[PDB]
Homo-oligomer: A and B are copies of this chain.
Amino acid sequence: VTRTAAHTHIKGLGLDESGVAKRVEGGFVGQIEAREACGVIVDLIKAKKMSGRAILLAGGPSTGKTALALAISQELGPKVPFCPLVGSELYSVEVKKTETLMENFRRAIGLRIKETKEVYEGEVTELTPEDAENPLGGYGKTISHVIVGLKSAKGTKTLRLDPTIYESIQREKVSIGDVIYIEANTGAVKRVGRSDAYATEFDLETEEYVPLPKGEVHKKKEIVQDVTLHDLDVANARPQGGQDVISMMGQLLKPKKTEITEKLRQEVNKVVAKYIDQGVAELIPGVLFIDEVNMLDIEIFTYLNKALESNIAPVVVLASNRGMTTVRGTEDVISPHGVPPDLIDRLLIVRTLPYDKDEIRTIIERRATVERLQVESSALDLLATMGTETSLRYALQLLAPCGILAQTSNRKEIVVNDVNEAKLLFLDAKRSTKILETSANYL
């Protein structure tokens, strides 16, 4: 029916109203202390008061680190911006890594704005331009004004435009008998389609047929918009959407990342604070999630120390699975989790713990019942012993070949023989290393 991929049996942290966690709730099994700590972090994010609070999730492989961050994102809801990331993604070839980190910092602070629009709309009834006296004079356009007659439901208006608006109108290829939509905030013109007041079946260019727009031609409507700070920074750094030459040629050239200056961010902050002061906008801080944080080097860590101390930064969540490893970009610095001690001093570490046989067995039960598979009890116990012997993920990933081998024998139940056949056909890391060690020519 649907598609399942390594997750999506997790819907939330599954906590009570007082913060205590049920053992089996929300798709989670075990990890009670980590779930309660993540609930405290979720409440801290929902308080919307703090800036630059950073935690770190530490533990071994297959212990439930990224599942907790995904559960945090599901608990917060879609109105809070959540920016997933991998530590290898900060190494770009177009811009420096510091700018990529600051862009992903600004991408995690949302904004809700109740803005208003001025709209002229209706069906075009006439289109007559008036020429200039000296067309070849070098200065000034060919035309001077264009008379446009618009007709809507219980209304009719006549408009006199400059050549600037008419240039965008004729760029939209507007004829007589079309329904248009002029937005006065930017001069943008949208051609909705042919009107249905005329014949329909005599066209050859797959158009759509639109009724007459209701209400008057001139209108004022309120639109609720959800944007981030990075959207404003990008739209101001590379200007598009105006009717001038510079914003028109900006849509045609190839886009490229640029080092946004601090002055532009300060001006955008000033304008956004002015919008909030009028009661129009409202700030929604969010979460930045950097997975595999050991891939970063010392320069990004040293810039992260500076960037966490700013007065706008969101809540940062990191994850790592290294014991005591050298930091990348250095030679002698040995630190826990691959994170330097000055950054470790600014964190709050949440420990994650390994599982047992019972938790592995019920996790296999949950993953089997998510994937619409029916497993026998003896096969379930065999898979639980397999998971404790080798790996949890190897037992989880062997469910679908077992189901296929059961289906190819015209059967619905998964039995022990299917699990034995899947053991024979597919290997794991330890048996592959055993084959690699006793082999002739670098297998």
Binding site for B on A (CB under 8 A): 245-246, 252
Contact = CB atoms under 8 A, between A and B. Distances in A.
A122 B252 CA distance: 44
Task: Count this chain's copies in the assembly.
Answer: 2
2 contacts: A245-B252, A246-B252
A384 to B, nearest CB: 42
Is chain A's interface secondary structure helix, strand, loop, or mixed overall? Answer: helix
Contacts of A245: 252
A245 B252 CA distance: 9
A246 B246 CA distance: 15
A311 B246 CA distance: 43
A254 to B, nearest CB: 9
A176 to B, nearest CB: 20
Nearest to A252: B246
A280 to B, nearest CB: 34
A249 to B, nearest CB: 8
What 2 pairs between A and B have smallest CB-CB spacing? A246-B252, A245-B252
A278 to B, nearest CB: 32
Contacts of A252: 245-246
A317 B72 CA distance: 59
A354 to B, nearest CB: 34
A245 B246 CA distance: 14
Nearest to A441: B341
A406 to B, nearest CB: 37
A197 to B, nearest CB: 29
Nearest to A249: B245
Contacts of A246: 252
